[PDB]
Amino acid sequence: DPEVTLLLQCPGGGLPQEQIQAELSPAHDRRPLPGGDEAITAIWETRLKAQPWLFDAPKFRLHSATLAPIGSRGPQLLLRLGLTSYRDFLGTNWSSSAAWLRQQGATDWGDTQAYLADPLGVGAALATADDFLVFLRRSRQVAEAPGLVDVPGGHPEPQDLAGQLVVHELFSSVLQEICDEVNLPLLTLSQPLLLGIARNETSAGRASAEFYVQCSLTSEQVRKHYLSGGPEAHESTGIFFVETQNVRRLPETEMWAELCPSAKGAIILYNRVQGSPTGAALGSPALLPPL
Numbered sequence: 001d002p003e004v005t006l007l008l009q010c011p012g013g014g015l016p017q018e019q020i021q022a023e024l025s026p027a028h029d030r031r032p033l034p035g036g037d038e039a040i041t042a043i044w045e046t047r048l049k050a051q052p053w054l055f056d057a058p059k060f061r062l063h064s065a066t067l068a069p070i071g072s073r074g075p076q077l078l079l080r081l082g083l084t085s086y087r088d089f090l091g092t093n094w095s096s097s098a099a100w101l102r103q104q105g106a107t108d109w110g111d112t113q114a115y116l117a118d119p120l121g122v123g124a125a126l127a128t129a130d131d132f133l134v135f136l137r138r139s140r141q142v143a144e145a146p147g148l149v150d151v152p153g154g155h156p157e158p159q160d161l162a163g164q165l166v167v168h169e170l171f172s173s174v175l176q177e178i179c180d181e182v183n184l185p186l187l188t189l190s191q192p193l194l195l196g197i198a199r200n201e202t203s204a205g206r207a208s209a210e211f212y213v214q215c216s217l218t219s220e221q222v223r224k225h226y227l228s229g230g231p232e233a234h235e236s237t238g239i240f241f242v243e244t245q246n247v248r249r250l251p252e253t254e255m256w257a258e259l260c261p262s263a264k265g266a267i268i269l270y271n272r273v274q275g276s277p278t279g280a281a282l283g284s285p286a287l288l289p290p291l
């Protein structure tokens, strides 16, 4: 799977909000481009002069994420975050010359990402009361990953002493994206756990935080809520469910070739952090079949 790399695998079956610190600092921003940010400005002008209804929006930038020594007390994760924008993304990660910007970042800064926007995405492994995960089909008419399978998520827009509010907006935004797209009531959803962070090598290495969320509704009820919004209530074109039993071997299925990279990230982390039991009971052959 060359189009996805794991930046972080969380311990203890995943991390709650209260165990994560953020450092939001202009030291974590993209570096100005070697020939000037006029190259980003030019791509944006060309785009607005064809699609003048487009808008810029701020985004969180992932710099890095440091896990504490395992088994320790206190905060378990430090997220180093900067700020970027939709416009900076279109002029860097989405650019035809994105591989050249990575090589120049290696040369100039010892960092393949130094000249990349790298907006932080969020995604969920969303489980039902009857032990299915939730999948969405993308429109064949959109620019990114057309007609591919996805999981719920988005790219949160901004607004440890502003740090804790930033972690709160990240956990909040994954629930909000589930309510907006799947049309589920907020009170049917668990507090999320962070499973890890995955990078999309097809989009020049931009990262998504992958979460586990439990719903108290069955798969038949989740479908009813999704469909009852109508075609205008969602960006996706369909919803479907795979038993948690069968997610274990999903990378061996024909479905795998149709999954967008960030959804592959979510399923790998679900299998490693929520699947893959460590104890004698769940590890017994009748409950963990070999092969």
Ligand SMILES: COC(=O)C[C@H]1C(=O)NCCN1C(C)=O
Pocket: 053, 054, 055, 056, 057, 086
């Ligand atoms: C229609 O989808 C797009 O690509 C539009 C785009 C935009 O205009 N501004 C920021 C990101 N975005 C949205 C709606 O989130």
